[PDB]
Amino acid sequence: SPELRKDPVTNRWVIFSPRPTDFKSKSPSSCPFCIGREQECAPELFRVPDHDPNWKLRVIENLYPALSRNLETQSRTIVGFGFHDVVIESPVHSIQLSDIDPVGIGDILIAYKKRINQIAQHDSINYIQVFKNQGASAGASMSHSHSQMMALPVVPPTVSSRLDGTKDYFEETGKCCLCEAKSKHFVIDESSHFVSVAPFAATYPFEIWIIPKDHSSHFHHLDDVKAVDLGGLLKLMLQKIAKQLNDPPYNYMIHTSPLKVTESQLPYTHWFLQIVPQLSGVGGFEIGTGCYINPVFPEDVAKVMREVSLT
Amino acid sequence: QSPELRKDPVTNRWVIFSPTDFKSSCPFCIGREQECAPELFRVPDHDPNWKLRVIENLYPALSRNLETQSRTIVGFGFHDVVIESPVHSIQLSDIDPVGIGDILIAYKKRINQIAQHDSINYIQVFKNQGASAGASMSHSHSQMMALPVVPPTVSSRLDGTKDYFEETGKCCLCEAKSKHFVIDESSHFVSVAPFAATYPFEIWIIPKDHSSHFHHLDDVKAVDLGGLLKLMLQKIAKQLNDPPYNYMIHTSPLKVTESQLPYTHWFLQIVPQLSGVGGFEIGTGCYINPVFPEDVAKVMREVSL
Ligand SMILES: *P(=O)(O)OC[C@H]1O[C@@H](n2cnc3c(N)ncnc32)[C@H](O)[C@@H]1O
Ligand SMILES: *P(=O)(O)OC[C@H]1O[C@@H](n2cnc3c(N)ncnc32)[C@H](O)[C@@H]1O
Ligand SMILES: [Zn+2]
Ligand SMILES: [Zn+2]
Ligand SMILES: [Zn+2]
Ligand SMILES: [Zn+2]
């Protein structure tokens, strides 16, 4: 039977309206991002290893940026100042992120952190969205493995909503709701520093959140040990998704603190990584209301995903 | 042109603008009624020769059987289907303004039935046309979903329009002619490309009178709206090569307070389906719109039918 559920992190109701194990995907050899072709890319910010011609990753400016870094002094309407960068995740054209080894994924995570720390030097930036698209229908335009970073001059709606809901919950219980993840959501897998779950009031079917076990407000406070540990758990979730759902397109999104987060917000602000496989679309109900309809309960997603074997 | 962020009290969120070239028998058929979930009413009333029918959805997202039961709440609600034509190949926009009016008056009838239930707080009337816009059936139809809660866009709209009214003493949709980019105008309605439109070629149809509730619509305004809706849908079809689309009626919460009425003003939103989203939108709840509403209005004002 259908149910509405709410969670402080989304701060909204979702409708659950249902077999879970019957859910499946319904979806060049070179390119400018390939090693050797660097002059065909927008300006480089840095690579790993540093200035090594034999690079493992590169962070570059987006050639078609959504926001303009040249509008900084200019700052109903505000100017479209921001940063839009691309993280090229492999020198090799055909390797997908989930095929990269945990240490290599750790290096990407650490590169997000290095770049965030660079952007955080600009007072005009209020939030940085790190995200990945895999698959045309999940918004990828390039087949080569990569992810993107968009730095914004405003705190966007999800972040505002999250701050509001987590604050209300903290005032109500004295607790950070993500510190309570193992009792509040449905655990899937656990690594040394992170736990993956099917979110109690998940927006999307087979949505998974990977959540630091320690209270951590900022993604970019990640260290190298946590990075490789997170890399391994991210890899695992992506490979279980790819097996269970027949390699669907997907997106992942890092949800982190605003750059000007206040001391008072710290106790209930806890970063996490959201993975959303693309399984279904929306129509007029969701557009009209901002309420989603999820056909699979998280109880059931967790059961399924815990039983996934990769051998 | 140069990117820009824009906000509107109605959405109460920033959108990033970052830029004429933009482009895209069954069980509901007259003679197949026993094959549907229970009929609620039809038009003409009890006429075997129906022009529209309002039925229960066969696969409802919320359960009408959970009313007595009501971080979790029971999935009580009403999920209904409005069948807009007895004829299988007719699209909504092909219907004459009066017939579209009838459909709008039927939405009104059904809202007033639903509003008799204290457990309902908001009713979303919406249409999907085309598989990729969420349609599962090609016969012309729209839907209504009655909810036990006020959903996020409605809460956001109430907040944003409240803020604006507190700062200006004005209802922002009452000023639509000076705030938004006018496309067409009827006797009681105006259609605009919204200043801070979420989606490329989004169009709002706004009542010119300050009207808080859709369902206070009368017969004259229904036919007037019908003709303007038809005009926008036909212009969209022609300019954008008949894309799939959605429309959504934005209206007041059923338990709206007196103090909310001065800045609460219903409207109808039309979204041609032209593009999709990626991790930026999912992560932030901020959209990126490739066409300024200035350019949309200019293109749309020139469409010849
Ligand atoms: P994914 O498909 O999520 O995003 C790809 C982004 O890469 C940008 N882009 C395309 N081509 C180039 C070059 N040559 N250099 C730098 N950036 C590039 C697109 O604008 C996408 O946003
Ligand atoms: P559109 O494609 O937006 O939505 C169609 C809705 O109609 C419901 N439905 C399908 N078939 C039937 C019957 N035989 N009776 C009543 N309702 C029906 C689908 O569940 C869609 O919600
Ligand atoms: Zn390549
Ligand atoms: Zn915490
Ligand atoms: Zn039919
Ligand atoms: Zn008004």
Beta bridge partners of residue A57, listed in sequence order: A48
CATH of domain B1-25+151-305: 3.30.428.10
DSSP category for residue B49: S
Interface check B303 vs A, CB under 8 A: no
d(CA B98, ligand 3 centre) in Å: 57
- Compute the nearest-CA separation of A129 from chain B (Å): 7
Going by their DSSP bridges, the two strands A12-16 and A293-294 should be labelled as parallel
Interface check B246 vs A, CB under 8 A: yes
Q: Is the dihedral of CA A289, A293, A298, A299 positive or negative?
A: positive
Instruction: State how far Cα B269 lies from the chain centre.
Output: 5
Architecture of domain A1-30+156-311: 2-Layer Sandwich (3.30)
- Compute the nearest-CA separation of B75 from chain A (Å): 4
- Compute the nearest-CA separation of A224 from chain B (Å): 24
Residues with CB under 6 A from ligand 1: A 32, 40-42, 60, 62-64, 86, 133, 140-142, 146, 148
Block residue for tokens 């100042």: A81
CA–CA dist B163, B288 (Å, integer): 24
d(CA A34, ligand 3 centre) in Å: 4
Q: How many helices (H) and strands (E) does chain B have?
A: 6, 14
Instruction: State how far Cα A7 lies from the chain centre.
Output: 18
Assign B147 to helix, strand or coil. Answer: strand
Q: In what order do the strands lie in the sheet with B14-17?
A: A77-79, B4-7, B14-17, B288-289
Beta bridge partners of residue A210, listed in sequence order: A196, A273
CA–CA dist B301, A305 (Å, integer): 52
Q: Is the dihedral of CA B179, B182, B186, B189 positive or negative?
A: negative
Interface check B285 vs A, CB under 8 A: yes
Binding residue ranges of A for ADP-alpha-D-glucose: 19, 40-42, 62, 133, 139-142, 148, 281, 285-286
Which tokens belong to A280? Answer: 């279904």
Q: Of A13, A289, A2, A16, give the one whose Cα is nearest residue B126.
A: A289
CA–CA dist B97, B236 (Å, integer): 17
CA–CA dist B205, A206 (Å, integer): 37
Rounded to 5°, the CA angle B231-B246-B151 comes to 125
Which residues of chain B have a CB within 8 Å of the CB of A132?
279
Polymer length of chain B: 305
Q: Please, where in chain B does CATH 3.30.428.10 lie? A: 1-25+151-305, 26-150
Q: Is the dihedral of CA B54, B60, B62, B64 positive or negative?
A: positive
The phi-psi region of residue B169 (left if phi > 0; otherwise alpha if psi is between -120 and 50; otherwise beta) is left
CB-based contact B71 A158, cutoff 8 Å: no
SS (H, E, C) B55-80: EECCCCCCEHHHCCCCCEEECECEEE
Longest dimension (CA), chain B: 58
Active-site residue numbers of B?
141
CB-based contact A254 B16, cutoff 8 Å: no
Q: What class does CATH assign to A31-155? A: alpha beta
Q: Please, where in chain A does CATH 3.30.428.10 lie? A: 1-30+156-311, 31-155
SS (H, E, C) B257-279: CHHHHHHCCCEEEEEECCCCCCH
Which tokens belong to A197? Answer: 């779950």
Q: Which CATH superfamily, name and number, covers B26-150?
A: HIT-like (3.30.428.10)
Q: Of A152, A151, A177, give the one whose Cα is nearest residue A164.
A: A177
d(CA A55, ligand 3 centre) in Å: 14
Interface check A124 vs B, CB under 8 A: no
Interface check A6 vs B, CB under 8 A: yes
Which residues of chain B have a CB within 8 Å of the CB of A73?
none
Cα-Cα end-to-end distance for chain A: 35
Suggest the residue from A250, A259, A287 to mutate for an interface test with chain B (most B CBs closer than 10 A).
A287
Block residue for tokens 């496309």: B183
CA–CA dist A130, A111 (Å, integer): 11
Technique used by the depositors: X-ray
Cβ density class A240-271: b for 16+ within 10 Å, e for less = bbbebbebbbbbbbbbbbbbebeeebebbbbb
Nearest to A15 among B75, B153, B248 (CB): B75
| Contact between residue B43 and residue B60 where contact means Cβ atoms under 8 Å apart | no
Block residue for tokens 């482009």: B23
